[PDB]
């Protein structure tokens, strides 16, 4: 299966690209702006089917914080430590922060 890029259109090998498990299609880091890491290399749910780690529902992209290194979804209104507002800075794991 070519599993061409989900959002960019183009064929690619299945090993050096992020392969979404649910969707079945892989994609380049540049297209979705995802850092190349072993955790995501295995295959992280692309933003097209991402879910909150609290309610397991998508949407609220501007109000949802996603980890740069690992794949985790945090809702500004129901994340692990709930916040009263949207952080002006980045809110992800320490490694994710950098």
């Amino acid at each position: 299966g070519s599993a061409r890029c989900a959002v960019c259109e183009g064929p690619g090998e299945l090993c050096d690209l992020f392969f979404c498990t649910s969707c079945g299609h892989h994609y380049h880091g540049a297209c979705l702006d995802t850092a190349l890491t072993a955790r995501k290399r295995a295959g992280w749910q692309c933003p097209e089917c991402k879910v909150c780690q609290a309610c397991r529902k998508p949407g609220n992209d501007s109000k949802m914080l996603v980890c740069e290194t690992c794949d985790k979804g945090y809702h500004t209104f129901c994340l692990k430590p709930p916040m009263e507002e949207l952080p002006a800075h980045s809110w992800k794991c320490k490694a994710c922060r950098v």
Partner: peptide, 19 residues
């Protein structure tokens, strides 16, 4: 550094996808 995190990742995805 801004909420560009998922905001830029998924929202831009819509721009390139919907395009």
């Amino acid at each position: 550094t801004g909420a560009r995190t998922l905001a830029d990742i998924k929202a831009k995805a819509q721009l390139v996808k919907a395009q």
